[PDB]
Symmetry: C3
Subunit: 276 residues, 3 copies
């Protein structure tokens, strides 16, 4: 015992941490479990990104406010899933508001051996008016959509219509491609727009329009504009042509009339001076 164990007690009261002024390990676990671990976890509220002088890059490998690199991992980078019956908005939205914006909303830069982007609308229980992909532009200065391919032996755009039913005449009103040409919806007075415009700006040796059925040629328009039709055909009007110079060329009115006039002349000549 002394008078100075009271010094040692005061050193402990001074130098050791009070319970009320620090978190216990259990309180710490509680508070840490409310935070996202780098190894994964479940976010139940809104996660907002608001980068601001944050070194975010445009790079298509290392950029982005979010960047997901799957180079060393199996699996998808990102999945958005819903089994909801109905809801108040789309799964994914990309939006840009300034008409000076000089980049795309979405850029896909794809190397690989399957389809870069693949959009599937599954069979509904009841048919309805909806599409896999809808495109709309209100920009008059540009094509709403552009496609450019380098196919050796295929179409740049390939469209297949497939009968949804087993019965051969169920799809008789359907088409692979349907084109409409309309006046302005709000107060338009008409339109002069064309349906299909085909050109070859460099010049092609190929057929401009080729039609087949069961793989057999039925109708074509050649590079010179001449056509070949494979069956009986009709013009509800006159057909202007060149005068024929071969047996199966269509005859003109001039050709008929000239032939008639030649025969006439020869016969009238024989009539005016036959003797018995």
């Amino acid at each position: 015992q002394k008078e100075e164990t009271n010094s040692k007690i005061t050193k402990l009261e001074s130098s050791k941490a009070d319970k009320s002024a620090v978190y216990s390990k259990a309180e710490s676990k509680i508070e840490l479990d409310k935070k996202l671990s780098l190894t994964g976890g479940i976010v139940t509220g809104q996660l907002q990104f608001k980068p601001n002088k944050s070194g975010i890059k445009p790079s298509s490998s290392v950029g982005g406010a979010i960047n997901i690199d799957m180079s060393k991992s199996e699996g998808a980078a990102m999945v958005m899933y819903t089994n909801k019956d109905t809801t108040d908005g789309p799964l994914m939205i990309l939006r840009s508001d300034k008409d000076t914006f000089d980049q795309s909303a979405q850029f896909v830069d794809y190397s690989g051996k399957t389809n870069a982007v693949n959009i599937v609308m599954r069979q509904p229980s009841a048919p309805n008016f909806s599409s896999a992909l809808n495109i709309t532009s209100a920009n008059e200065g540009g094509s709403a959509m552009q496609i450019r391919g380098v196919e050796k032996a295929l179409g740049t755009l390939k469209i297949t219509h497939e009968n949804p039913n087993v019965e051969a005449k169920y799809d008789e009103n359907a088409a692979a491609l349907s084109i409409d040409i309309v006046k302005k919806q709000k107060g338009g007075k008409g339109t002069a727009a064309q349906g299909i415009y085909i050109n070859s700006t460099s010049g092609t040796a190929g057929k401009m329009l080729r039609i087949r059925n069961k793989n057999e040629d039925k109708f074509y328009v050649g590079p010179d504009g001449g056509f070949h039709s494979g069956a009986n055909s009709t013009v509800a009007g006159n057909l202007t042509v060149k005068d024929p110079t071969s047996g199966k060329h269509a005859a003109t009115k001039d050709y008929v009339d000239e032939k008639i006039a030649e025969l006439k002349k020869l016969i009238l000549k024989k009539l005016e001076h036959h003797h018995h």
Copy 2:
């Protein structure tokens, strides 16, 4: 004496080492958690909102919201250099056929292409596309496009020869259409290739075909056509009786002119005297 009270107050009121983290242990535990200023996540981050005030708003909504208004750079980049893998990079999925919104909505103002998909040149050509579209919904068009072009096509397709040699692409086309029966047990099809219409009515050509920018064939708004070269029908062609020199003559026209000449000649024959 009464210092055993003071000792018991310290044993009661002071924190035990075993029951609290050191500063060093705290750093370790904090470094495992994501800083608001950024970090690297190495596991799955799952979003499971549930009565969480998530909105549909195309500016402030989303379980994730990225606003790039005040920042340079991309909002999001998904990248892979992997040789092969077990699934697509991004997937959107909706399971109920009553679902009444889109999987993806792009709302774009700007002066370049809103969405831009590029398939790069492979080492070896293969059957794969930039964009593949499939619908099993018979009540709707698989794809729809609407544009308001002053002087362009709503859809522009260009085919470009992949090779220097002029004939290499002789089996290619800009647009290729096929019309097929149902794959599982179908008995045939009556579907059409191309259906063009103007529901309001157009003064324009329905089909206009050029080569090197010079008109070669067209179909006009009335259905009449102009062909720019020798042509063939493997069959009969029905026309109207000609009323001008270069109109094609009908069988009736030929026969009536033959009959008129006949009549005139037989009349002169039956009635001349010597």
Copy 3:
């Protein structure tokens, strides 16, 4: 008294020093720098680098990020900008290996509106830009494919709408515009076709049907026969079959043979008439 120096040494041993632990307030400061699972604002780059981390391809539960909206209103993800200009696209998907055997994006959609919907809004000034641009340099495959099963519609539906009230303003426009070009770098030409229509199975339908105000104007039928609904022209000869009906076009052979028959009959009547 005397031996409580053991009890003091047990306190010096067992109790935490102030200097070696964070106060509650220091802890709050450090925790407030970290993201709460209930939400918050990230201001730097969030990087995902999974590496033997059990990430799956599943279109319901996979992904380094997975968003399930089954139990919640709202969008899964929103990317927005009101910026004037910037240095790159909002969203980017990129794959580098030409052996890569999956898609960049897969949309598996059931529902009753459009799966993917791309809208280019009206700009202040017309310009050359599109809602959707597609480009392939793969010669072995079609740049784009579409398959549909429509009962009574087109698989691809294209509408051109006049941007202006005046009827002739859009006279150079088209619903579909096709070009056929040689290779840009040193190409010697092309033999590619414009439009190729086929039915591999065989169709009873018209191959090409053109209407104006819903009335048939021109068509090509399943057999290749055409019907044109107005005055028409060939700048050249037209080969046809010899006519066997009144309105069939007459051939040169038909004209010549009928001329020769009449000739024969007349010369015969001439060499044998008597008065």
